[PDB]
Amino acid sequence: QCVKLNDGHFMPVLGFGTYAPPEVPRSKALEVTKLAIEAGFRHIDSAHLYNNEEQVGLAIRSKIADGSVKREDIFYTSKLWSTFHRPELVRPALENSLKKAQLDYVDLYLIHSPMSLKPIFDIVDLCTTWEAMEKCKDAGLAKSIGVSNFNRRQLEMILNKPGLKYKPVCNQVECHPYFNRSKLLDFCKSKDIVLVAYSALGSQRDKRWVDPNSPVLLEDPVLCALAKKHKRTPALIALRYQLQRGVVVLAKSYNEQRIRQNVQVFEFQLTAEDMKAIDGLDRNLHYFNSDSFASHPNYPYSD
Numbered sequence: 546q547c548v549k550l551n552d553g554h555f556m557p558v559l560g561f562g563t564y565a566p567p568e569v570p571r572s573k574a575l576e577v578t579k580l581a582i583e584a585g586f587r588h589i590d591s592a593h594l595y596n597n598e599e600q601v602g603l604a605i606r607s608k609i610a611d612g613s614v615k616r617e618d619i620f621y622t623s624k625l626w627s628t629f630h631r632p633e634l635v636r637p638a639l640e641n642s643l644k645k646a647q648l649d650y651v652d653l654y655l656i657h658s659p660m661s662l663k664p665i666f667d668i669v670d671l672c673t674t675w676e677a678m679e680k681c682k683d684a685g686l687a688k689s690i691g692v693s694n695f696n697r698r699q700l701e702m703i704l705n706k707p708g709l710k711y712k713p714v715c716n717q718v719e720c721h722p723y724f725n726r727s728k729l730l731d732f733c734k735s736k737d738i739v740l741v742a743y744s745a746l747g748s749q750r751d752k753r754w755v756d757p758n759s760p761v762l763l764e765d766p767v768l769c770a771l772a773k774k775h776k777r778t779p780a781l782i783a784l785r786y787q788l789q790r791g792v793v794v795l796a797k798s799y800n801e802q803r804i805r806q807n808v809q810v811f812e813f814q815l816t817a818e819d820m821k822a823i824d825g826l827d828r829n830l831h832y833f834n835s836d837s838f839a840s841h842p843n844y845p846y847s848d
Protein backbone atom coordinates (compact mmCIF):
# COMPACT_ATOMS: atom_id res chain seq x y z
CA GLN A 546 0.00 0.00 0.00
CA CYS A 547 0.75 3.77 -0.06
CA VAL A 548 0.62 6.72 2.39
CA LYS A 549 -1.13 9.92 1.19
CA LEU A 550 1.43 12.81 1.15
CA ASN A 551 0.51 16.27 2.42
CA ASP A 552 0.15 17.55 -1.24
CA GLY A 553 -2.48 14.80 -2.06
CA HIS A 554 -0.11 12.45 -4.07
CA PHE A 555 0.54 8.87 -2.86
CA MET A 556 3.92 7.25 -1.93
CA PRO A 557 4.23 3.49 -1.69
CA VAL A 558 5.40 2.61 1.84
CA LEU A 559 8.13 0.19 0.70
CA GLY A 560 10.88 1.47 -1.61
CA PHE A 561 13.77 0.00 -3.55
CA GLY A 562 17.24 1.45 -2.79
CA THR A 563 19.36 1.73 -5.92
CA TYR A 564 22.73 2.85 -4.61
CA ALA A 565 25.73 0.57 -5.19
CA PRO A 566 29.38 1.63 -4.78
CA PRO A 567 31.47 2.41 -7.89
CA GLU A 568 33.09 -1.04 -7.87
CA VAL A 569 29.70 -2.38 -9.01
CA PRO A 570 29.24 -2.16 -12.81
CA ARG A 571 26.62 0.36 -13.93
CA SER A 572 24.61 -2.34 -15.74
CA LYS A 573 23.75 -4.07 -12.44
CA ALA A 574 21.31 -1.24 -11.50
CA LEU A 575 19.35 -2.00 -14.68
CA GLU A 576 19.02 -5.70 -13.88
CA VAL A 577 18.17 -5.36 -10.19
CA THR A 578 15.68 -2.51 -10.73
CA LYS A 579 13.73 -4.62 -13.22
CA LEU A 580 13.84 -7.54 -10.62
CA ALA A 581 12.63 -5.18 -7.84
CA ILE A 582 9.67 -4.16 -9.99
CA GLU A 583 8.97 -7.83 -10.93
CA ALA A 584 9.00 -8.65 -7.18
CA GLY A 585 6.36 -5.97 -6.46
CA PHE A 586 8.38 -2.84 -5.51
CA ARG A 587 6.61 0.28 -6.86
CA HIS A 588 8.76 2.99 -5.17
CA ILE A 589 12.33 3.36 -6.50
CA ASP A 590 14.88 5.62 -4.80
CA SER A 591 17.74 7.17 -6.84
CA ALA A 592 19.77 10.42 -6.99
CA HIS A 593 22.09 12.44 -9.19
CA LEU A 594 24.87 11.29 -6.78
CA TYR A 595 24.33 7.60 -7.55
CA ASN A 596 25.48 7.79 -11.22
CA ASN A 597 22.80 5.20 -12.11
CA GLU A 598 19.83 7.28 -13.19
CA GLU A 599 20.17 6.13 -16.87
CA GLN A 600 19.96 2.48 -15.81
CA VAL A 601 17.18 2.95 -13.28
CA GLY A 602 15.04 4.99 -15.71
CA LEU A 603 15.78 2.39 -18.38
CA ALA A 604 14.57 -0.33 -15.97
CA ILE A 605 11.38 1.63 -15.34
CA ARG A 606 10.75 2.31 -19.07
CA SER A 607 11.41 -1.32 -19.96
CA LYS A 608 8.81 -2.52 -17.37
CA ILE A 609 6.40 -0.01 -18.89
CA ALA A 610 7.34 -1.11 -22.43
CA ASP A 611 6.66 -4.81 -21.74
CA GLY A 612 3.29 -4.02 -20.05
CA SER A 613 4.12 -4.95 -16.40
CA VAL A 614 3.26 -1.49 -15.02
CA LYS A 615 2.16 1.90 -16.15
CA ARG A 616 4.17 5.06 -15.39
CA GLU A 617 1.54 6.18 -12.91
CA ASP A 618 2.14 2.83 -11.03
CA ILE A 619 5.76 3.76 -10.40
CA PHE A 620 6.93 6.23 -7.77
CA TYR A 621 10.37 7.50 -8.79
CA THR A 622 12.53 9.67 -6.56
CA SER A 623 15.60 11.64 -7.47
CA LYS A 624 17.63 14.06 -5.40
CA LEU A 625 19.40 17.37 -5.84
CA TRP A 626 23.08 17.04 -5.04
CA SER A 627 24.66 19.55 -2.59
CA THR A 628 26.83 21.33 -5.26
CA PHE A 629 23.49 22.49 -6.74
CA HIS A 630 21.90 24.33 -3.76
CA ARG A 631 22.16 27.81 -5.36
CA PRO A 632 18.57 28.43 -6.41
CA GLU A 633 19.41 29.00 -10.13
CA LEU A 634 21.10 25.58 -10.28
CA VAL A 635 18.03 23.66 -8.96
CA ARG A 636 15.78 23.29 -12.04
CA PRO A 637 18.62 22.60 -14.41
CA ALA A 638 19.87 19.76 -12.10
CA LEU A 639 16.34 18.32 -12.02
CA GLU A 640 16.04 18.69 -15.81
CA ASN A 641 19.33 16.87 -16.11
CA SER A 642 18.17 13.93 -13.88
CA LEU A 643 14.98 13.72 -16.01
CA LYS A 644 17.00 13.50 -19.25
CA LYS A 645 19.32 10.78 -17.83
CA ALA A 646 16.33 8.70 -16.80
CA GLN A 647 14.41 9.69 -19.92
CA LEU A 648 11.30 10.45 -17.88
CA ASP A 649 8.86 13.36 -18.16
CA TYR A 650 8.68 13.85 -14.36
CA VAL A 651 9.94 12.50 -11.08
CA ASP A 652 7.36 11.55 -8.45
CA LEU A 653 9.63 13.04 -5.78
CA TYR A 654 12.51 15.43 -5.79
CA LEU A 655 14.51 15.91 -2.59
CA ILE A 656 17.17 18.21 -1.38
CA HIS A 657 19.70 15.37 -0.87
CA SER A 658 21.39 16.99 2.19
CA PRO A 659 21.48 20.35 3.93
CA MET A 660 25.28 20.40 3.70
CA SER A 661 26.03 22.76 0.79
CA LEU A 662 29.20 22.22 -1.23
CA LYS A 663 31.02 24.61 -3.72
CA PRO A 664 29.19 24.52 -7.17
CA ILE A 665 34.97 22.74 0.15
CA PHE A 666 31.76 23.91 1.84
CA ASP A 667 29.38 26.55 0.48
CA ILE A 668 26.96 28.76 2.38
CA VAL A 669 23.55 28.86 0.85
CA ASP A 670 20.24 30.00 2.22
CA LEU A 671 18.23 26.74 1.91
CA CYS A 672 14.98 28.65 1.94
CA THR A 673 15.99 30.06 -1.53
CA THR A 674 16.84 26.45 -2.57
CA TRP A 675 13.43 25.48 -1.34
CA GLU A 676 11.74 28.25 -3.36
CA ALA A 677 13.43 26.85 -6.48
CA MET A 678 12.12 23.35 -5.60
CA GLU A 679 8.60 24.80 -5.34
CA LYS A 680 8.95 26.21 -8.87
CA CYS A 681 9.87 22.68 -10.04
CA LYS A 682 6.67 21.37 -8.53
CA ASP A 683 4.71 24.21 -10.23
CA ALA A 684 6.24 23.34 -13.62
CA GLY A 685 5.28 19.63 -13.25
CA LEU A 686 8.96 18.52 -13.26
CA ALA A 687 8.41 16.89 -9.83
CA LYS A 688 4.96 15.79 -8.54
CA SER A 689 6.15 16.20 -4.93
CA ILE A 690 9.12 17.80 -3.32
CA GLY A 691 10.86 17.07 -0.02
CA VAL A 692 14.16 17.05 1.85
CA SER A 693 16.69 14.57 3.08
CA ASN A 694 19.10 14.50 6.02
CA PHE A 695 17.42 17.44 7.67
CA ASN A 696 17.19 17.70 11.41
CA ARG A 697 14.27 19.26 13.24
CA ARG A 698 15.69 22.85 13.35
CA GLN A 699 16.48 22.62 9.57
CA LEU A 700 12.98 21.43 8.77
CA GLU A 701 11.49 24.29 10.93
CA MET A 702 13.53 26.80 8.89
CA ILE A 703 11.56 25.71 5.83
CA LEU A 704 8.15 25.33 7.57
CA ASN A 705 8.62 28.80 8.97
CA LYS A 706 9.76 30.52 5.73
CA PRO A 707 7.66 33.62 4.86
CA GLY A 708 5.51 32.99 1.77
CA LEU A 709 5.93 29.18 1.90
CA LYS A 710 3.91 27.52 -0.88
CA TYR A 711 4.61 23.76 -0.37
CA LYS A 712 5.67 21.96 2.76
CA PRO A 713 8.20 19.18 2.24
CA VAL A 714 6.16 15.98 1.81
CA CYS A 715 8.93 13.89 3.57
CA ASN A 716 12.30 14.01 5.29
CA GLN A 717 14.41 10.98 4.16
CA VAL A 718 16.92 10.20 6.92
CA GLU A 719 19.10 7.42 8.39
CA CYS A 720 16.70 5.42 10.51
CA HIS A 721 16.91 1.84 11.92
CA PRO A 722 16.70 0.19 15.39
CA TYR A 723 20.17 1.57 16.41
CA PHE A 724 19.19 5.10 15.45
CA ASN A 725 15.38 5.12 15.41
CA ARG A 726 14.87 8.91 15.33
CA SER A 727 11.65 8.70 17.41
CA LYS A 728 11.64 12.39 18.48
CA LEU A 729 12.24 13.56 14.86
CA LEU A 730 9.54 11.06 13.79
CA ASP A 731 6.99 12.62 16.29
CA PHE A 732 7.86 16.08 14.98
CA CYS A 733 7.34 15.03 11.32
CA LYS A 734 4.00 13.28 12.20
CA SER A 735 2.82 16.55 13.95
CA LYS A 736 3.51 18.47 10.72
CA ASP A 737 2.11 15.79 8.41
CA ILE A 738 5.55 15.10 6.86
CA VAL A 739 6.59 11.46 6.15
CA LEU A 740 9.81 10.12 7.58
CA VAL A 741 11.39 7.89 4.97
CA ALA A 742 14.12 5.58 6.40
CA TYR A 743 17.37 4.83 4.61
CA SER A 744 20.06 2.39 5.88
CA ALA A 745 17.03 0.62 7.33
CA LEU A 746 19.02 -2.64 7.15
CA GLY A 747 22.14 -1.02 8.70
CA SER A 748 23.72 0.45 5.53
CA GLN A 749 26.16 -1.03 3.02
CA ARG A 750 28.96 -0.37 5.57
CA ASP A 751 30.98 1.52 2.87
CA LYS A 752 34.64 1.96 4.09
CA ARG A 753 34.55 5.65 3.01
CA TRP A 754 31.95 6.55 5.66
CA VAL A 755 31.21 3.68 8.06
CA ASP A 756 33.40 2.42 10.89
CA PRO A 757 33.92 -1.42 10.34
CA ASN A 758 33.95 -1.80 14.15
CA SER A 759 30.37 -0.62 14.34
CA PRO A 760 27.79 -3.35 15.34
CA VAL A 761 26.26 -5.10 12.29
CA LEU A 762 22.52 -4.40 12.57
CA LEU A 763 21.30 -7.57 10.88
CA GLU A 764 23.41 -9.68 13.41
CA ASP A 765 21.59 -8.07 16.27
CA PRO A 766 20.57 -10.77 18.87
CA VAL A 767 17.09 -9.20 19.55
CA LEU A 768 16.40 -8.93 15.78
CA CYS A 769 17.61 -12.50 15.42
CA ALA A 770 15.35 -13.73 18.27
CA LEU A 771 12.41 -11.90 16.69
CA ALA A 772 13.15 -13.43 13.24
CA LYS A 773 13.11 -16.90 14.88
CA LYS A 774 9.89 -16.05 16.80
CA HIS A 775 8.09 -15.04 13.57
CA LYS A 776 10.02 -17.45 11.28
CA ARG A 777 11.12 -14.47 9.21
CA THR A 778 14.59 -12.86 8.92
CA PRO A 779 16.36 -10.06 10.80
CA ALA A 780 15.95 -7.87 7.64
CA LEU A 781 12.23 -8.43 7.49
CA ILE A 782 11.88 -7.61 11.20
CA ALA A 783 13.79 -4.31 10.67
CA LEU A 784 11.58 -3.34 7.69
CA ARG A 785 8.34 -4.33 9.49
CA TYR A 786 9.30 -2.25 12.50
CA GLN A 787 9.38 0.91 10.32
CA LEU A 788 5.98 0.23 8.71
CA GLN A 789 4.39 -0.18 12.13
CA ARG A 790 5.76 3.15 13.29
CA GLY A 791 4.30 4.92 10.23
CA VAL A 792 7.72 5.21 8.57
CA VAL A 793 8.18 4.66 4.80
CA VAL A 794 11.10 2.28 4.53
CA LEU A 795 13.67 1.83 1.77
CA ALA A 796 15.57 -1.43 1.23
CA LYS A 797 18.61 -1.84 -1.06
CA SER A 798 19.50 -5.31 -2.38
CA TYR A 799 21.36 -6.27 -5.54
CA ASN A 800 20.63 -9.96 -4.84
CA GLU A 801 17.68 -11.68 -6.55
CA GLN A 802 16.60 -13.77 -3.54
CA ARG A 803 16.84 -10.91 -1.00
CA ILE A 804 14.98 -8.52 -3.34
CA ARG A 805 12.09 -11.09 -3.47
CA GLN A 806 12.30 -11.71 0.29
CA ASN A 807 12.01 -8.02 1.21
CA VAL A 808 8.46 -7.64 -0.17
CA GLN A 809 7.38 -10.20 2.49
CA VAL A 810 7.39 -7.25 4.94
CA PHE A 811 3.66 -7.00 4.07
CA GLU A 812 2.94 -10.62 5.13
CA PHE A 813 3.18 -10.53 8.94
CA GLN A 814 2.98 -8.08 11.89
CA LEU A 815 4.97 -7.45 15.00
CA THR A 816 3.21 -7.24 18.40
CA ALA A 817 3.46 -4.38 20.88
CA GLU A 818 6.05 -6.41 22.93
CA ASP A 819 8.09 -7.01 19.78
CA MET A 820 8.05 -3.29 18.91
CA LYS A 821 9.13 -2.32 22.50
CA ALA A 822 12.06 -4.86 22.34
CA ILE A 823 13.10 -3.23 19.06
CA ASP A 824 12.73 0.30 20.52
CA GLY A 825 15.10 -0.79 23.33
CA LEU A 826 17.97 -1.16 20.76
CA ASP A 827 18.27 2.61 20.14
CA ARG A 828 21.85 3.70 20.73
CA ASN A 829 22.36 6.91 18.79
CA LEU A 830 24.34 5.08 16.08
CA HIS A 831 24.39 6.74 12.71
CA TYR A 832 26.46 4.43 10.46
CA PHE A 833 27.51 7.40 8.30
CA ASN A 834 30.09 8.88 10.63
CA SER A 835 32.89 10.58 8.71
CA ASP A 836 34.99 13.75 9.11
CA SER A 837 33.79 14.61 5.62
CA PHE A 838 30.20 15.18 7.03
CA ALA A 839 30.79 15.92 10.68
CA SER A 840 33.07 18.95 10.15
CA HIS A 841 30.37 20.68 7.94
CA PRO A 842 28.68 23.87 9.43
CA ASN A 843 25.23 22.36 8.73
CA TYR A 844 25.97 18.78 9.69
CA PRO A 845 22.59 17.62 10.95
CA TYR A 846 23.77 15.42 13.78
CA SER A 847 25.33 18.26 15.78
CA ASP A 848 21.52 18.86 16.53
Ligand SMILES: NC(=O)c1ccc[n+]([C@@H]2O[C@H](COP(=O)([O-])OP(=O)(O)OC[C@H]3O[C@@H](n4cnc5c(N)ncnc54)[C@H](OP(=O)(O)O)[C@@H]3O)[C@@H](O)[C@H]2O)c1
Pocket residue numbers: 561562563564565590591657658693694717718742743744745746747748749763778780781795796797798799800803804806807
Ligand atom coordinates in the same frame (compact mmCIF):
# COMPACT_ATOMS: atom_id res chain seq x y z
N1 LIG B 1 19.18 10.16 1.40
C1 LIG B 1 20.46 9.80 1.63
O1 LIG B 1 21.37 10.59 1.91
C2 LIG B 1 20.69 8.32 1.54
C3 LIG B 1 21.77 7.70 2.19
C4 LIG B 1 21.94 6.33 2.13
C5 LIG B 1 21.04 5.57 1.41
N2 LIG B 1 19.97 6.22 0.73
C6 LIG B 1 18.99 5.44 -0.07
O2 LIG B 1 18.49 4.35 0.81
C7 LIG B 1 18.75 3.14 0.11
C8 LIG B 1 18.87 1.97 1.12
O3 LIG B 1 19.93 2.20 2.06
P1 LIG B 1 21.43 1.54 2.00
O4 LIG B 1 21.98 1.36 0.59
O5 LIG B 1 22.28 2.17 3.05
O6 LIG B 1 21.16 0.02 2.31
P2 LIG B 1 20.18 -0.90 3.29
O7 LIG B 1 18.75 -0.90 2.72
O8 LIG B 1 20.43 -0.41 4.81
O9 LIG B 1 20.94 -2.29 3.02
C9 LIG B 1 22.06 -2.81 3.72
C10 LIG B 1 22.44 -4.18 3.04
O10 LIG B 1 21.34 -5.01 3.39
C11 LIG B 1 21.45 -6.11 2.49
N3 LIG B 1 20.07 -6.70 2.39
C12 LIG B 1 18.99 -6.28 1.74
N4 LIG B 1 17.98 -7.13 1.97
C13 LIG B 1 18.46 -8.09 2.79
C14 LIG B 1 17.94 -9.25 3.38
N5 LIG B 1 16.63 -9.59 3.17
N6 LIG B 1 18.75 -9.99 4.17
C15 LIG B 1 20.03 -9.70 4.41
N7 LIG B 1 20.57 -8.59 3.82
C16 LIG B 1 19.79 -7.81 3.04
C17 LIG B 1 21.92 -5.54 1.17
O11 LIG B 1 22.99 -6.38 0.66
P3 LIG B 1 22.73 -7.12 -0.82
O12 LIG B 1 22.67 -6.12 -1.89
O13 LIG B 1 23.83 -8.19 -0.86
O14 LIG B 1 21.37 -7.94 -0.68
C18 LIG B 1 22.34 -4.14 1.51
O15 LIG B 1 23.60 -3.84 0.89
C19 LIG B 1 20.07 3.40 -0.69
O16 LIG B 1 20.23 2.38 -1.69
C20 LIG B 1 19.67 4.76 -1.30
O17 LIG B 1 18.63 4.53 -2.28
C21 LIG B 1 19.79 7.59 0.81
Ligand SMILES: C[C@@H](C(=O)O)c1ccc(-c2ccccc2)c(F)c1
Pocket residue numbers: 564592594657658694833834838845846
Ligand atom coordinates in the same frame (compact mmCIF):
# COMPACT_ATOMS: atom_id res chain seq x y z
C1 LIG C 1 26.15 8.57 -0.20
C2 LIG C 1 24.90 9.46 -0.07
C3 LIG C 1 23.69 8.55 -0.28
O1 LIG C 1 22.59 9.04 -0.64
O2 LIG C 1 23.93 7.34 -0.14
C4 LIG C 1 24.85 10.12 1.30
C5 LIG C 1 24.88 9.34 2.48
C6 LIG C 1 24.82 9.99 3.73
C7 LIG C 1 24.70 11.39 3.80
C8 LIG C 1 24.67 12.04 5.05
C9 LIG C 1 23.89 13.15 5.32
C10 LIG C 1 23.95 13.71 6.63
C11 LIG C 1 24.75 13.19 7.65
C12 LIG C 1 25.58 12.10 7.36
C13 LIG C 1 25.51 11.55 6.07
C14 LIG C 1 24.68 12.10 2.60
F1 LIG C 1 24.57 13.41 2.64
C15 LIG C 1 24.75 11.50 1.36
